[PDB]
Amino acid sequence: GSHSMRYFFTSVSRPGRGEPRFIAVGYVDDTQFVRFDSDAASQRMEPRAPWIEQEGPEYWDGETRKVKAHSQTHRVDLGTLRGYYNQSEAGSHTVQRMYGCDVGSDWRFLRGYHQYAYDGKDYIALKEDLRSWTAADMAAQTTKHKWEAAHVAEQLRAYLEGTCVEWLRRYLENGKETLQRTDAPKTHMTHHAVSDHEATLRCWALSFYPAEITLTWQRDGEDQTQDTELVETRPAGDGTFQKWAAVVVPSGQEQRYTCHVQHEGLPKPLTLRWEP
Amino acid sequence: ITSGIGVLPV
Amino acid sequence: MIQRTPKIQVYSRHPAENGKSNFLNCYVSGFHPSDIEVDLLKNGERIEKVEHSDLSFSKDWSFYLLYYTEFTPTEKDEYACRVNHVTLSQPKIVKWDRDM
């Protein structure tokens, strides 16, 4: 289908001693493939997947230099932001940045992101267009005239519509059996006597990819978001994901209900029922 | 491929 | 300034069977700030050999990790996840339920 790439960068200040924690990571759809970690020994960018490994030792060199620049950039940022918000030197603060591109099934550029947060909260992001900014407040309204004077938008447009995309295909083309796969879910359903006369019906979805999936309940042919339980989609460890929705019901009214699944992997929408 | 451009200080 | 307490799930990579090989996961999502502490217990003893994923984040900027450890289920064995965060009074112990 459509695909994407994202990079996630986090920096965390350590006031009472040290320089700041810096972690980076990249995802092609829901598969991690690279990572940098300031704290861990090597001080390299490290492959995290098997298909990416093949790239020669100047791929990694370039990536390592670039990643260290980002981390010097976040180093200065944290201190600037203390400046902007007249914050004490003895709190610990947090800068995340996230960016990357989406492509259509034609593999062409579809959209782009670039978003910046301080202490868990949107600070500045670029808008999804011929490029302008959205500043969360007057402190970030400052980084606006700053970034406008530097033509920062135009610099990212060029990367997002340019090398981000040109390079995304290089990873799809090369990681095909890991990245162009779409595993259907292995569905099943369990029953648990919980009360005197009120039971549970969990409906499980095991080992699927990609991670988008819907799991609805229906008492007698309508939606039922109220009275369910739906745990957030989790990853399994082996490249695929897990998920489940359950529902409390009255005893001897089990065949009333139907678990509905939608997924890319499924040509047709599925439906289970407490048959056993 | 991470960006050598954009990515400025605030 | 904004804090967010973690959401925990404990579960195996495959469905359980006494005496076969499997991985035990603790998946911690939605938290802020990032600094977190997560052990995996077996009969209430920290298991040293655990691994974990590179910290990443969601669409609302909250963080998530996965921790995991090779194991063999059995009837007598009892497995939990113990967790601390800047938002948590004492730690949070979440047991493993084979049917969760």
Author numbering:
A (entry chain A): 1 to 276
B (entry chain C): 1 to 10
C (entry chain B): 0 to 99
Give the exact sentences the study uses for this entry:
The best-known example of such a heteroclitic peptide is derived from the Melan-A/MART-1 where the natural 10-mer epitope is EAAGIGILTV, as used in this study. This natural sequence does not have an optimal anchor residue at p2 for the HLA A2 restriction element. In summary, we used a T-cell clone derived from the TIL of a melanoma patient that persisted in patient PBMC after long-lasting tumour remission to generate a novel APL super-agonist peptide with the sequence MTSAIGILPV. This APL was capable of inducing greater numbers of T-cells specific for the natural antigen EAAGIGILTV from the PBMC of 14/14 healthy donors and 2/2 patients tested compared to the natural antigen itself.
